[PDB]
Structure formats: C-alpha cells, structure tokens
C-alpha cells in the first residue's frame, strides 16, 4: 500500500518533528536536585545552570531525568506486553486472528509507526521485537558521557513516549483478542466498585497488580469447583479493571470486584478483610510481606519482576504450602506455575479464612484514646506529609472530642505511612483515621462501567465531523494515577462539569474508579447518568493504564477514517493533523508512575496536549508555547505552502494546574483548535467564558484574540461581546447587520488546511 | 520568624535565607518592579485580607495564580491571572513585557501556595533566571531567595500584621 | 550434546546461585543520598533506614540505584554490539564464519549463557534478542513499587551483568570476525599512545568514543587516497584501541596514533592541537562543541545516541557542509551517512588545518601573570575539586615563582573543569596547569601492545594446571576506567610489582593506556620489559572494554578445557569452579561509569573478585564475607556431600582500597584459593607475606589461617614461621621432622572437590 | 573549629553538628569503647605526631586503614591494620568481637581521611548502625555525627593541640 517517511522510526527519523513541535512548545525543566548523582566522578553541583565533571548542566541533567522516567514507563508497558504476549501465543496458538470489533484499522498506533498491518497473533512478535531493540538502544543514552544537548534528550522521550503507546496497544490487542474481553461494547456492564462491597464473612482474596494472566486461573478454578459464590475476590490497581472484563463479552455482569485504586493498598491490607493477597506487578507497595506477617495474611506472588524475597516453591506441592504457610513457617512464596497458583491462591483462601478471625490493625475505643491525648502536635507528620495535611491540628481537635476532622482527612490521605515514621511518639495516624472514617469505609461503594477497549469505526465516522469541526466541543481523556492533590473528587467534579456541556469524556486508569465511586442526590453515579457511546454528554470507560493507547488510536482514526489520510508510517503527518484540527485534550490529575509520564509525553508527540495535577511538576519537564510572541503562531497552508497565522490554542504541550476550576478552565481553552467551523468556534468559546466566569469571576482577557467572526462570537452574548470589542479593542464594527468589519488579526476562511510541515 | 527553618527533604546545599519581619518589609519597599504571586491558599479570610492590604501599600499588581481570582474581584487592586507554570516559566524570558507590558518582574513576592507546588515552580527561577523571591507564607520555601521560617497560624497572621504595620 | 539446567537464564533461574553467593559475600549498601526522588510521591526522606510513601526503605533504594547502574552499563554494551552487529552484517554478509583464532570454544560467554555454539554472524542476532528482551525485562523493574526487597534487586543486577558479558562478547567476536583485527597474537605490534606522539605541523582527526565502525570509512578513504603520510588521525577512549587493532592481522605497526583516556579529552580539545573531531558513541565530554567554536574546531557526530543539538545534514552534498563549516554558518554536523562521513572528515581536515593557525587556550607567561596573581587562595575551587587537590596552595606557590606545584597536579587532575565555575575571580585553572606541565606534555609518550583480543586454547591447556594448582600465583585482570584517586601511576606501579612476582597480568580498556605511557631507567615501558603471553610474568593486553568479556572467558575456559566440565548453559557449576579453583582477582582503579559496575558485577556472578578505587564507594554496593563467622566458610564435598571447611578467601567480591599499596596486599592476598596445592599455597602464602611486609611493615595477622601443612609455609621462612606458631598460637610441631601434628583446623587432603551446590 | 561549614554537594537534611575542640575532648574522654580510625592521611609528620599523642592519652585502640599501618610500628600504641569498607561493614553488626575480642565500640574517631572516601564509609555507618562518629579533621564530613568544620593546616594543627592538650 501508500506507505510513509517514517516506519519503524528511530531517534534521527523523528527528529524533524519532534524539534518543530519544541520550536513552539518550549521545554521548561524544574530540576528535583541541583546535584547529578551518577557516575563516580559525581555528584557534580549544577546550581545556578553551572556544569558537572562531564561537562552536562542543570537543562542536560534534568532532561536526562525525564527522559529517564519517560523509557521506564515504556519499558514497563513493553515488558507487560511481551509477557503477555508469549502467554497468550503459549496457550491460545500463534495463528489466531485478531478480534478486536468492527474496526477496519484494528492496530490505529501500531500501524502508524511501525507500517504494519497485523492479522495474526503472531505478527505481533516483530513489532515487540522493534520496541524492544529501540528501548534498548534508547536506555544506552542514560549512560555518563553519552549525549550532551538536553533537546535532544527531549526528542528521544517523545521517541520512547511513542514506543510506550506502541507497546500498550500490542498488550491491549494481545490480551483483548484472547481472553474474552468486551469488543467494543458500547453498554459494558457495571460492576461495584468500593471497600465496602466486599463481605468480611467469606473468604477474600485481593489481586494487587496489573498483570491479568496469573488471576485468569485461579478463576478459572473458582468457576470449575463452583467457589464464586462461597468465595470473594477483589482486585486493585488496573487489574481489577482487566478481571472485570474477563470473558465478559456476553454482558452478563460479573462476580469479581474492585477495591480501589493504589491508595487503598493499606487501607485494605490493615482493615484485616484480605484473606489471601496474591501480588502480580507494576503497582504494588513494597510493605506488604510486614503488614501481613503482623495481620497474619499469606502473600504470594506470581511474577519474576516482583518476588519480595519470599522463598520460592515453584516445584513444591501445593499442599506442603498450604501447610507451610498455615503452620506459619513462611509469610508468602512465589509461585510461577500459573496453574499451580490458581489451584493454591482459592484453597489457601479456605484454608485460612477461619484461621485469621477478626484480626485488623484498627484501634476499636479505647488504644485511640491514649494515642489520641498523647501527641501534643509537634508539627512534624504534617512536615512529612506529601500532602501536608493538618494532621497535628486534627488530632488536637480530636482530643476535644471532635473526629470529623480525620475523617475528611481520610479521603485527602493517600495511604503513604510517611507520617507514623517521623513521630517521637510512635502513632499509627493512619489507623486513627480510618477508624475516624470507619462510617464512610463502610458505606465507600460505587458503579464503574467495564471498559469497553476500544472505539469502532462506525462511532468515529459518526463523531469525526463535529470533533473536527468543532461541533462536538471536544475529548477530555481523563486518564493517569491516584495521587491527587485534593482527594478523589476533582476527577469527579472535572467530569461532571464537562459532560453537563456535552463534552465527550473519556477515562481509563484509577481515574474511572475514583469517578465511579461519588453519587449524586439521586444515588447515581456518571455511568448511570450519562451512556458510554463516543459522542456528546457520554463517558465511556476504556479499561486499564494498557487501554490508554485507544485514545491516541481513535484521535489517529479521525484522521484516517475521516480525513482520508493515509497511517501507513506517517507519525508526522497525522499528529500535524491531531494538532491543528483535533480537539482533544488530556488530563491526568493524580499522576506519579513513570507509566504517566510515557503516556503523557507520547500524547504530546500525537498533538494531545495534557493538564496534570500540582503533584506532577516534579517531573522536571513541561512543554509551554509563548504566548506574547507572534512569531511562533504560524503555520504553512497546505494548498499553496504560505504563512498562515492561528490562534494561540493550545498553549501548552504539558502543564501541570493548582486547582480542579484551574484545570477545567485550562481544559476548556485548550480545546480550542485552528480550523474551527464558525459554530465550533462559539461553542468551544462559550463554553470557555462560561467556565472562566463561573470558577474564576472574569471574562477571560485573551478571548479577543480567537474571534475570526460575529459567527464566531457565542449567539446569547454576541451583542454584549461586540460592544466590549468596539469599545476596549477599538474594532471597527458594522453595527446594521451585526457584522464584523475591522479588527481581527486573522480573517475567517471557509476552507483552509493550515499544517505545520512545509514538505 | 526565623526560628525554625527545618525541612524533610532538601533540593541541594544553596538554600533560602529565613528573613525577619523587619528584613522582608524593607526588601518589599524596596523592590523597583514587583509582583504579588497569590496562590489559591489566600482564599482564607485571615490572609486575603492582610494581601490585599499589602498590595494596596505599595501598588503592587498581583498574579492570582490558579483559583485565587474570586477573592481579587471587587476589590482595588490591579490583579491578573496567570498559570504558576506559565508564570514560572515567562519570569525566565527577558522579553517578555509582563502583565501589563513593561518588561518582566525584579522580584515577586510569594503568599498562600502550596509547598511542594511553589518550591517545583521556583526550582526553575532560582536556576534558569535573575529575579529575586519573598517568600511570606507560613511553610519554609527552600528554592527562594528569601523566606519565612515554618510558623503556626497565628503567628503567620502576626507576622503578617507586624509586615503591614511596616510598610 | 549435554546441555545445563540454566539456558537462557532470567532473574527466576539464577535466583539459587544469586542467593547462594550473597549467603556468604553480604552486600554493605553505602547509600549516596538520604532520599528518593523517583515518583512524585516524593521525595522521601530515608534517613535511618526508614520507609518511604511506597514502603521501599533505604536498602532497597540504594540496590535499585547500583542495579539501574548496572543495567544501564549492559544496555550501552548490549546497544554498541546490536548496531555493530547489524553494520557488520549488512556490510560483509551474514553468511560469515566466525574467526576468533584457534580455539575450540569461540564463544565462551555466550555458550555458558545462552547454551548456543555460533559458528556463523547470523547466529549472533538470536543472542543480541535474548539480551535486549531481558533487559527490557528488567528495565521494567526500576518502576515505582515494582520490587520490594533489595536482595531481589542485588539477584537482577547479577543477572544484568551476565547479559552484559554477553553483550560484550557478541559485540568484539563480531567486530574481530570481520574487521581483520588480530587473532589472538601473542607478538601484537606496540604503538605509539600519547599527547605528544601527534605532530601539530600537520592536519589532526580527533576521533572521540567507542564505535569504530563510522571511523573504519574514514581510515579508507585515508589509505585509498594516500593521505596517511601527510595527515594524522589519534583516537581517545576506546576507539583508539580498535582503531589500533584494525587491519592488523599483518602485524605491520598501524599509522593512526593513541591520544589518552578520558580525562585527556579536554586537555587535547585546549591545547588547539585538534583540526576536526569526530565523536562516535560513548564516554564523549559534553562540552566539545562550546571549546571547539572557541578554539574553531569543527565536531562531527556519527551516531544517533550522540547528536549534541547539531544540525542533521545527511542527505546534504559534503562541498557544502565543507563550505558551511569553513565559513563558521554551523558549529558542526550530524552525518550518519558512513562513506559520506568517510569522504567528509578527512576533506574537512585538510580544508580547516591552515584556517586555524596556532590557535590555543594556554597563556604562555605574561598573562598568566595575572592569571596566578590574582587569586587569593580563598578555597573555593579545592571545595570543588573532586580529588580535593591543593589548587588554593598550588597556586599561591606559582604567586611566589614556582610553578612545580601545578606541574605536579597535572598527573593528579581529571581535567573535569570543575574548579572553574566556583571561582568569584575567573581563574581558568586548568590552562594554568597545562601551561604549568607543558614540558611534561612535550615528553608525554609511551608506547602500548595492540590488543590481542581472544586467549587461544593451546596456551590455556598449558595455563590451567598452573592456575588451578596454584603454580602460577594468579591473575590479575585490571580493567576499568581513568577516575584514579592520585594519578595514572598507581596502576603502572601495581602492574610492576604483580609482573615482578611471575603473575599474570592482563590488562584492557584506558588502565592499558595508563601502563604504556610510564618508563623506567632504561626508557622500556613494561609492554617492552615483559612479555605478551598467558603465562608467569606476562602482561597481555586484550583490547577495549568490549574485551573485557575475554577474561572472564578465560576463566571460564580453564574450567572448560582444563578440568572437562561442560559448558552449555552451566552457569552455576562453571561459577562455583571459578569461585573454589581458579585464583583470578580484578582490578578498577579508576572505575566511574556504569559499564565498570555492570562489568564488576558480572564478574561477581562468575566467581572473580574485585577491587575498586576509592571513588567506586559512590557505586552504593560492596558484596563483603564476615570473616569471624565460621559458618559461613563451609562447602560441600563434591565426592560425598560432606561439610568440608575453606579458609576465609576470598574475603569479598567487590571491595574498594584507599591507596593503591592496600590494593596491592589485597590482590595478593585474594588470590588464595580453596583446594590449592601444596606448592600453589607456598607460592601464594610468600608473596602476599612479602607484599603485606613491604607495604605495611608487618606480618599479616590472619596468615595462620591459611597454613595446612609444613610445605604450605614458604621454603624460605618455614622455620621462623614454625616457630611463630609453636609460641603464638600455641600449635604442637614434630620439631625432629620439621612436621605438623596439631593446630591446623582444615588438614590438607591430597585431592578434594570443595564446591558450594548440594547438587 | 565550627565558623566553616561550608559544603558542594549535600546528603540530605541531617547534616553533622559543627563540634568545639572542648566538645572534642569531652567526647573522646567520655566515650567507653573508642576507636581511633586513621587513614593513610595521617602519615603526614605534623599529623602522625598527634594521632599517635591522643592514642596514648586514653589508651584508645588503633584502625590504621589503608597503608597508614607503617606510621604505627615502632610506637607504643595498639594499632592494626583494616579495611575501611570492610570495618564500616563490621561495626554494623552488633556481634563483631572486634579488633580485640570484645565486642563493637560506641564510637569512632576519625582523623586523616579523604573526604569522597571517608562520607560514602560513614554512610553506611550513620544509618545503618548506631555507632556515634567524632570527625577530628580539618574537612567537613557530613555524614558523622560530630565533626570539625573546615580549616586550614595551620588551624587543624592548632585544634588538634588544644584537643590533646584538654585530654
Ligand atoms: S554524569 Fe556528569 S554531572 Fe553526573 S556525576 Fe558524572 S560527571 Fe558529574
Ligand atoms: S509527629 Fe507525632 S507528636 Fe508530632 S504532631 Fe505529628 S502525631 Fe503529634
Ligand atoms: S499516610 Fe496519609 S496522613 Fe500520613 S503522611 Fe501519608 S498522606 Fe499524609
Ligand atoms: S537526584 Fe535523588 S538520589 Fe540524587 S541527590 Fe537528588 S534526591 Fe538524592
Ligand atoms: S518510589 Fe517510593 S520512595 Fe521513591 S519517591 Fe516514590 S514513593 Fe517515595
Ligand atoms: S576558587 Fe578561585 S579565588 Fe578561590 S582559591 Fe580557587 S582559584 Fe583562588
Ligand atoms: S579540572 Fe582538575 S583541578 Fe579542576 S576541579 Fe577538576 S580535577 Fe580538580
């Protein structure tokens, strides 16, 4: 077929786009250190942008560090999809066709930089092949004396950014054409999602991680020796979200749980409900094995990138172990034999639930009295608190009498221990408060929709037009972590917010959950309140971290299926086309991981630009465009290659806001596209003022520079706007007609196609 | 205000100098081109008023980073607003003309941000730029050029007076 | 034929043997900050072995960080030996037999490892996928709460350096197969490596880092067009070395020169002798494009991994790059074209060498009047120095007139320009020290035997009894980078003392550079004065760091061809016979990149300890055995599984020494091996005796220990030592036949198997 | 001995308490199981005059590190020769016999040390173990728990006669 310039790319090949994408969008580096703690001749100081022994300065390290963080997270989301894979094509066979909907572009980011165009499972094998070659090649780079330019350490991350989303959407196909997952499924089920849907009278076992492979037979077992309804089983992290979808494209709802996102891991772990705790990888506390010797809850893990030192008992018996783990012997064991685990984990579940019997770290009335009137709030917890939290203030508070004051605590604590270990009173605060929100935990319940995977052809030919357009306002994709600022409600609020405009909301990730998790006066939640389809006021829920790359895939099928534009190879091309016409933004509130990182920073090489939250500027990069500078809004007009200038929109790659209104504000702007219909432009500029009026009190000052036309301005405060532009900005306006005469810097074309390649 | 300057995790060995009432009150008046970055801390009834006053002494307009605006509404004062970020990041260009368009800021006084957010923001000033910082919260900014030391509530608030009562 | 438990070995499969030798050899973790600046969780404070938000404490830490070391060393090995790979076969074909001389086992790394025999270059690129698959695997571990436990982190970075002897033997079989470089000779021709061996009356390549497949086209050109004679090419690092061994097969002296190691990089960029410089992959100073603009040296980047923000013009014409350069339009370029880079570098030389006339940053004497009389000596610049040098009273003694001061720091200076950037005077200290050391610049000549490459199978069967018995007192493998605490001579002087004893010295990477470039009375260099053999009292030199693969597979081949043990995937048994027989210790004196540790590490997992200089305690990992432990020190009877006692040696696996005569008594001392003959031990016992005596002026307190038998004391001193310990230790000695009756706790048994698996 | 602490690159938040030579004495003739630890460094004539003086004051056994044991033979102080990675590895282990045969000891006295070797030994004694660490050279060691701050030779040799002469 037409192929393109770029398959296969590397980091020479994307270099011409990747420095004209920094050519507006400059780096800003916010270094965590002044200090480069590498190689022996180090640490060399690099305060005030001084240079180290190498010669490297404080731009060179910092970018090093991103770009670090940016290929572990490819790295992780490689590596799950290489396991994965080898499973699946162990178990299932190589030459099984792949399933993933009615789609005619199964694989949107594979086929993009890699120029294939897989049918089978086995052709999925070379492309993990390049990813991991070039991951290789990339982490070559990290070496002492091995590159000196901190831009192009930036364009090597927007490589592995762009290798991170190759991998997760072979993981995603790999596992979605096997096991049964819902193919496209517009009305998933909803599944309940909390603490507190989980029975403490039955045996429970919690699945922390984000491999799916190992818990798909200790189903399995729990289904063939009809355990599901004598038995709980809970997951956390994005693996409960990959359970959930397992064999559920019937629709039937399923028996599996979800817990909670990662700060729940010890809340969970020392309310005492685990029975069994089974650890795959990815996100799992590294404290585990000492909460659940005291707790008396065996671990086990399944994985080789995580084994905790436990002993391993691969070629064991699986009833020496369940003896040895009953008699106390051991604390846990790593178990690599998929199927002895799913045999171990369900017994080793009825084996111990009626040994362990109301055990739980969580003081009941009378130790919280002393260890409440024992602090006399030194001030240093809330010196160790990520959050800074008013923890002495709350608990003098609580001495009183009072224990609200912990109790929202509760949902603004991440669950981290970072208090308990600096106090010279050894006090388990974050005991204190969950006992102090004990009546919350209780009632912490929620409906989150299974993800649907990804989005069909049918939808985006539907949808194309008003995202283009404008008319659909545009794609928030609310993605990332759980490490909010402000606990789990700003996701909550943001989504709310957008899908009363008609936005098109799309989450994956712990943000689904935490989403799910709050109601309304009516008792409903987002999902029930609003469907799953891919067009305006719908949130669909597109699975775990791994389904992130579905995004990325239906904003490259707006170019392809709509636009006509050729994938085949053609990065550069189609993320113009993203950039310039696309109206999508994203969104990562509670971001942290490496994962995060990769995700964001491949959404910026697409043209996604992204919000995250106050947490994420210790990533030491954002990618901000000068705004008061006129000589970076301009692009080539595709027809005859001149000077066509746009409007500062989005003016930013990567930033990270203060506040859930800032973030709706800058997600409302950021939308904003060239190329706007003349009702796309006063819809996408009437909702901005309304929000900007709503959560900051002004009328924006920079809305004059994004009318091209009375057509533009928003139809219930045309009249009102007009007479702000006459007066204030001296624009000559017809007023007979209402028409526009003077004024705007950039005359309203009916059909123009500005890019930023001149080629 | 400067008794306690302890810290959980430092940045480097160049730290911040923890200033008195006295020492931050005449930096402030003495400052040519300032700038007052209000983070959306200042919301609380005890400090927006006391910023207000401070930027009514000496005229200084206000960056009402995040969602700090609301509070700066109706009052008489000459506020914007900017990203943090964004701000951050323009403070290191020399061209840039500013929000109103006479160049860029000398100094910029800091009140009501989040710690572990202004220190981020900062780390990219204190490098990469010339302009000096005042903090006046009640947290220990380590990446500023001068600040307070860690203080309660209350003594946030009287150390604030005692700066208003100077200028 | 007979394969091993262990083919394509993974974090899981090594796990035993890991946690086999960490029984005995514990690591020390020195933790180089008391924080953790990896997610935005953090970071979190460490201090006193606590835990952070995600429950890693500072154990787990600090192994992350000496694991992420480790493999970021094997991924640049791993990288430079996939791209040479490809090159090679793309070039010369895949169909290539391999020739790696005469010897019977051309992989020995490669067969332990992965269990193939490759008698082709396209039976390489299945090995170089298992290497990059399992590094990705492992990258994938570095994530936020992945692992928990630091001796799971030790067990990966083990593993990480395998792979990486494994990538450095893929990498030189394919380079010495195919680039005509000797083949295992003995009678390697000596060249000329020094500053001062370049004439400045002629045009200068300076050809900077690892890969010496962009420098081969160049050299082509060179000869093809006859421009030997009248231009002059010097390489620094290790592309000097491969460089030198190209072509060489003839054993005709080559005509390209060795400049020095890295820390001459800046010293030569200064001193104005360079006309253009070429960097290839590795090692390379970032801060070569801000001297040469300066001093007009035009820079050419070759690779993808090193682009340093220059301008790609690889599709543009080479006159008009030329034009561009000479008229100073751009600072440099990026060809990645190979011939055309080839045709260019020399062009450019010959069009640049008579532009740039005399042009140096060295004041001769009168503005360095003020230069040295304007200082005040106030200490910032000795603060800033990592090898805390006197610059403050050095200087302050030039003020009054002698300039022997800095003359004498030159050899003491890295060249790292870190005293430069604290100065509140802008003092370029560094140019004052060259000019100070000028006449030692003018004689700074050596000469150093071409790399020999591969150690053939006949003088291995000759070697091993010797070894293995310990007739031959051992080998001295010293390897590593130029990060020397007190200068290049401590290696000169080590490897002087260890040849004048009859032990095997074998050398690789810059300390080979640093041997070659010292003389004694006589003007011979030790490459001159001793032999290059395998064998007592022969220095063999075996090439670059990607030949340092070649030690460890000598060590491997005396268990190989010597004592008949298989090799095929056999990675436990053949380590555990290299840890209890073979008497092999390592040598870093001035370790500080990342590929030094993945190289230390990997010659842990092979039973071969190593000291360190004082700068690699930065690494944040030493694997040290308690010597007043008695059960640590017990092996099993390989004839019958019985507890057979050794004595406490060697007493680590990676240790790091203060003054490099402390690195001398420890290497004699590490030597000693389990199962040593009675002669082997006498040999032994004497010089470490000797050693411990000369350089700290007396008797080793732990020798008793060692001593089994009458003959195992040393011929010379057997009656004083007898009587040492009949008075001493109180040991009850057969007077009349000069016999042992008791004290001994180990009796010497004529013919035992000590080994460490059950098994 | 304290007006100078002044350091490049720092560890962390806890940091050495700049130590008087008073305090210096107090603490060497305080102490129940010393030890002096001394690096090659000591070897210099002014040096090795008094380490070996503060040796024979309070009898404190002697860890001659590195090729520091040959200034020890002749002199009437018990000195033996150790690495310094390998007695950093040891003092944290509580059931060491020693050098001797009786167990650990409380605190180590450091003196002729490089620094960049000396702080990565003591960071793994300062955290790991609960060993105390009198730092009597003439550089700051931050990772000790009490050190002496920056000096010249001149005022290191001056300190160390005051310390012997109070002991
Ligand atoms: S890599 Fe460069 S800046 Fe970092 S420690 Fe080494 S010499 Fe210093
Ligand atoms: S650290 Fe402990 S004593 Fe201090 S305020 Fe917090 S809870 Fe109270
Ligand atoms: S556990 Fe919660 S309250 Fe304690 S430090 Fe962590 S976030 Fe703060
Ligand atoms: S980068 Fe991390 S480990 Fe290195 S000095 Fe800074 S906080 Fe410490
Ligand atoms: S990885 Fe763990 S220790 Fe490091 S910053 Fe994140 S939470 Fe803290
Ligand atoms: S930093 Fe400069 S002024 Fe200070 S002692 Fe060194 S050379 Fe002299
Ligand atoms: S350039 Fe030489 S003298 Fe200057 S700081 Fe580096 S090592 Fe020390």
């Known amino acids: ?759 | 205000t400067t008794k306690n300057t302890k810290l959980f995790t430092s940045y480097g060995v160049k730290t911040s100098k923890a200033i008195t009432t006295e020492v931050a009150a005449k930096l402030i008046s003495k400052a040519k081109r300032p700038l007052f970055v209000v983070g959306t801390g200042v919301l609380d009834p005890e400090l927006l008023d006391r910023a207000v006053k401070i930027a009514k002494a000496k005229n200084i307009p206000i960056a009402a980073t995040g969602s700090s605006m609301p509070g700066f509404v109706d009052k008489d004062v000459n506020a914007k607003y900017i990203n943090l970020h964004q701000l951050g990041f323009y403070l290191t260009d020399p061209d840039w003309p500013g929000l109103d368009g006479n160049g860029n800021y000398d100094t910029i006084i800091l009140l009501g941000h989040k710690k572990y957010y202004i220190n981020q923001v900062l780390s990219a000033v204190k490098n990469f730029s010339d302009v000096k910082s005042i903090s006046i919260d009640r947290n220990y900014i380590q990446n500023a050029t001068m600040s307070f030391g860690n203080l309660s509530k209350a003594d946030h608030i009287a150390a604030l007076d005692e700066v208003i009562d100077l200028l």
């Open chain 1, 1 to 759: 077929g037409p192929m393109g310039p770029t398959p296969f790319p590397t980091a020479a090949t994307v270099r011409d786009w990747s420095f004209t994408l920094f050519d507006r969008y400059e780096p800003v580096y916010t270094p965590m250190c002044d200090q480069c703690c590498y190689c022996t001749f180090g640490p060399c100081n690099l305060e005030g942008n001084r240079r180290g022994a190498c010669g490297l300065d404080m731009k060179g390290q910092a970018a090093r560090e991103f770009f670090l963080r940016c290929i572990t997270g490819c790295a992780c989301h490689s590596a799950h999809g290489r396991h994965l894979l080898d499973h699946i094509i162990s178990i299932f066979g190589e030459d099984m066709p792949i399933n993933m909907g009615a789609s005619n572009v199964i694989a949107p980011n594979i086929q993009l930089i890699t120029g294939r165009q897989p049918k089978t499972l086995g052709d999925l094998k070379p492309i993990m092949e390049y990813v991991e070659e070039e991951l290789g090649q990339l982490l070559a780079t990290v070496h002492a004396g091995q590159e000196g330019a901190a831009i192009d350490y930036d364009n090597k991350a927007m490589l592995a950014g762009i290798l991170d989303h190759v991998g997760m959407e072979v993981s995603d196909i790999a596992q979605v054409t096997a096991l049964g997952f819902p193919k496209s499924d517009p009305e998933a089920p909803l599944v309940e999602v909390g603490m507190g849907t989980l029975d403490a009278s039955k045996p429970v076992i919690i699945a922390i991680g984000h491999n799916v492979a190992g818990v798909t037979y200790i189903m399995d077992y729990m289904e063939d020796n009809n355990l599901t309804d004598k038995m709980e089983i809970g997951g956390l992290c994005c693996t409960a979200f990959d359970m959930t979808r397992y064999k559920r494209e019937d629709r039937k709802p399923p028996y599996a749980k979800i817990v909670g996102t990662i700060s729940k891991e010890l809340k969970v772990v020392r309310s005492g409900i685990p029975d069994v705790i089974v650890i795959d990888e990815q996100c799992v506390r590294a404290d585990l094995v000492e909460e659940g010797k005291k707790l008396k809850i065996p671990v086990i893990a399944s994985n080789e990138k995580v084994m905790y030192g436990l002993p391993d008992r691969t070629n064991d018996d699986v009833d020496a172990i369940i003896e040895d783990i009953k008699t106390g012997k051991i604390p846990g064991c790593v178990m690599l034999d998929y199927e002895k685990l799913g045999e171990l984990v369900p017994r080793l579940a009825m084996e111990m639930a009626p040994l362990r019997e109301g055990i739980s770290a969580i003081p009941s009335d009378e130790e919280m009295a002393s260890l409440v009137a024992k602090c006399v709030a030194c001030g240093e917890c809330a010196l160790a608190c990520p959050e800074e939290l008013d923890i002495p203030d709350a608990i003098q508070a609580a001495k009183e009498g009072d224990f609200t004051a912990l109790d929202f605590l509760h949902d603004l604590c991440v669950g981290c221990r970072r208090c308990e270990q600096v106090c010279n009173k050894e006090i388990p605060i974050l005991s204190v408060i969950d006992k102090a929100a004990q009546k919350a935990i209780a009632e912490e319940k929620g409906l989150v929709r299974a993800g649907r995977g990804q989005v069909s052809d049918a939808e985006i030919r539907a949808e194309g037009l008003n995202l283009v357009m404008g008319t659909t306002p545009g794609v928030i994709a609310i993605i990332g972590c759980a490490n909010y600022p402000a606990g789990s409600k700003d996701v909550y609020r943001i989504a709310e917010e957008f899908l009363n405009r008609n936005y098109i909301v799309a989450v994956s990730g712990c943000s689904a959950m935490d989403i799910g998790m709050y109601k309304d006066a009516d008792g409903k939640t987002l999902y029930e309140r609003f469907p799953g389809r891919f067009e305006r006021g719908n949130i669909l829920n597109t699975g775990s971290c791994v389904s992130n790359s579905h995004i990325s895939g239906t904003c490259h099928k707006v170019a392809a299926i709509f636009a006509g534009r050729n994938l085949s190879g053609n990065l550069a091309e189609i993320a113009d086309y993203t950039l310039n016409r696309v109206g999508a933004v994203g969104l990562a509130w509670g971001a942290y991981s490496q994962k995060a990182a990769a995700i964001g920073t491949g959404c910026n090489m697409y043209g996604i630009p992204a919000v995250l939250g106050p947490h994420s500027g210790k990533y030491r990069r954002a990618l901000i465009a000068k705004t008061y500078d006129e000589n970076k809004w301009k692009v080539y007009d595709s027809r005859n290659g001149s000077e066509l200038d746009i409007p500062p929109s989005p003016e930013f790659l990567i930033t990270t806001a203060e506040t859930w209104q800032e973030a709706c504000v800058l997600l409302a702007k950021n939308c904003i596209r060239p190329s706007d219909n003349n009702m796309g432009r006063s819809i996408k500029l009437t909702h901005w003022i309304e929000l900007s009026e709503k959560y900051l009190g002004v009328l924006p000052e920079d809305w004059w520079k994004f009318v091209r036309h009375e057509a533009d301005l928003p139809l219930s405060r045309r009249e009102e706007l007009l007479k702000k532009l006459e007066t204030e900005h001296g624009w000559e306006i017809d007023w007979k007609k209402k028409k526009i005469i003077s004024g705007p810097k950039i005359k309203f074309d009916v059909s123009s196609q500005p890019t930023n390649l001149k080629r």
